[PDB]
Amino acid sequence: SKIYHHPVQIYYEDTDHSGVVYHPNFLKYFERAREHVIDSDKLATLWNDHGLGFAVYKANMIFQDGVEFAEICDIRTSFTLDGKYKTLWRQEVWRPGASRAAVIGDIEMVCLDKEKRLQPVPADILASM
Amino acid sequence: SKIYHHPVQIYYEDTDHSGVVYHPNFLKYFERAREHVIDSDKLATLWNDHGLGFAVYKANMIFQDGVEFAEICDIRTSFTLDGKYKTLWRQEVWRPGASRAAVIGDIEMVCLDKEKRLQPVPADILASM
Amino acid sequence: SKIYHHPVQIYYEDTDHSGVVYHPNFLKYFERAREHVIDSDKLATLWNDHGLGFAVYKANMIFQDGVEFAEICDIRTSFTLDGKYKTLWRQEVWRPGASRAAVIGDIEMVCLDKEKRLQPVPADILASM
Amino acid sequence: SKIYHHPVQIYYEDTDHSGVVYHPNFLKYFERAREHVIDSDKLATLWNDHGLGFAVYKANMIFQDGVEFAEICDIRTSFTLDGKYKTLWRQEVWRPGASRAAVIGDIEMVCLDKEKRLQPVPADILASM
Ligand SMILES: [Mg+2]
Ligand SMILES: [Mg+2]
Ligand SMILES: [Mg+2]
Ligand SMILES: [Mg+2]
């Protein structure tokens, strides 16, 4: 895919008392950013037409710098097809002008039927990206 | 009802960078405490036998003191029936030995059918409390 | 003040398994919207120049309709000064074209010194709104 | 270390509308469980006596099964020392009687000074485990 961009602002809800973003939250921001790549309409169409859904199977996170209250960051997201069944997503939290990401995620998503068996990703949901 | 007690420990997820529990979280703790009064089995039975569910209609919160990281507090919960349709819950966050609550909530819950019409609370779900 | 507008999109993180936004989350959205009215720079200036901060003292919520996954709503926020010490905020979650709010909050905020005593809100933090 | 156990109950706050625990939440539960291994008193002592804190550097998650509303699970946690600076934590969400974990996390934590340089973990914070 191309690199998608999704802005995230850090609010009170995002920080803990150590004074930085509470680390589990980054996976939430990554999930949000993915919802802008494969939106709810696409997911609903996949479910109704094909009986398929995507699930996160693995998420490997590297936390490289603390992020403060009131920062606006850019979530950079791209994915590749890995065979018929799996999508591998690279997601990164960036600051303007930085030379490296604050947080990196490698996310593996599988395409499952209602019997929780792997099924090929249909061509139509992939087509726009 | 009687006064129910539910312990809550304050973890990193609960605080913000101002150094106290992030205020929207108290309503979560109140919801948890209510799940110990009317558990999931009772809710499921209500839904399946009667087609009814409870919804929070109003929540009035008073935040009287900040709560710090790593505190263990006691959520005190009681409710009264208000007519046929409504339950009024008093919920309070307490510290050991305090003379007043840290946080107070008055919560009004309604009993709704699938048409979102008010319906009487059945006698069976109330009986144990 | 004037009516401020803040968009909120409903993601997976926002819903529960009953199929609507989990009610404590609305107070979070209200907090976000307030951060766009009195931003972090203003708060920091208040703290450093005056030794003052704002705290939510009371929040009275009415939940009038369920909000679904993937909705985009408009948070409408306005406030009034109530004497020297207190700000009263009206916040509402709206859908496009609706005639009434999905969720209403009346929020009372106090202006406190480090001794947790009420102090007058300085003219400068109010001036732009 | 030995295997520590920490119970987690799944409440409304934990699920999303797909009907299972929202995946970023598992890292929160893992953080909680770690707070029962190295409690706030130990962390505070480390900070004040040594000027050191722990940070999560990497978290590798495998999501092997969906977890439903109202389940009670057991978080199993153990760690090993990896050289002088790093602790490697294995954390797992288990159901009673299962033969495999629902969710697995491998978490790498580093011991940092205020200059964000790696420093040896002191013997005293490790001693009880
Ligand atoms: Mg198709
Ligand atoms: Mg019955
Ligand atoms: Mg001034
Ligand atoms: Mg020492």
Side-chain angles (χ1 to χ4, degrees), chain B residues 45-46 49-50 122-125:
Chain B
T45 296
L46 183 65
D49 293 344
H50 299 263
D124 56 15
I125 186 175

Side-chain angles (χ1 to χ4, degrees), chain C residues 26-99:
Chain C
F26 292 103
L27 256 186
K28 311 192 168 186
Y29 311 149
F30 291 170
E31 199 286 332
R32 291 178 204 171
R34 291 192 312 273
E35 303 191 34
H36 285 273
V37 178
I38 303 181
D39 67 30
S40 64
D41 288 333
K42 291 174 150 290
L43 293 182
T45 296
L46 183 65
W47 177 255
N48 290 305
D49 293 344
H50 299 263
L52 299 177
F54 296 131
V56 177
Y57 175 48
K58 289 179 181 176
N60 294 352
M61 301 292 283
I62 313 176
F63 305 97
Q64 299 194 140
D65 195 24
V67 178
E68 293 175 50
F69 175 58
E71 290 196 45
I72 298 176
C73 291
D74 177 33
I75 308 290
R76 290 180 201 172
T77 300
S78 61
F79 71 90
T80 62
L81 251 169
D82 183 354
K84 272 194 183 304
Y85 309 102
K86 311 198 309 85
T87 304
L88 303 178
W89 300 67
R90 175 69 165 210
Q91 302 190 266
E92 300 177 350
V93 176
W94 281 82
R95 299 191 169 98
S99 295

Side-chain angles (χ1 to χ4, degrees), chain A residues 6 9-13 28-29 31-33 35-36 40 43 69-70, chain C residues 6 9-13 28-29 31-33 35-36 40 43 69-70:
Chain A
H6 178 68
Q9 176 166 333
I10 304 307
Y11 296 102
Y12 272 92
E13 69 198 72
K28 311 192 168 186
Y29 311 149
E31 199 286 332
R32 291 178 204 171
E35 303 191 34
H36 285 273
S40 64
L43 293 182
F69 175 58
Chain C
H6 178 68
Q9 176 166 333
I10 304 307
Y11 296 102
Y12 272 92
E13 69 198 72
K28 311 192 168 186
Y29 311 149
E31 199 286 332
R32 291 178 204 171
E35 303 191 34
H36 285 273
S40 64
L43 293 182
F69 175 58

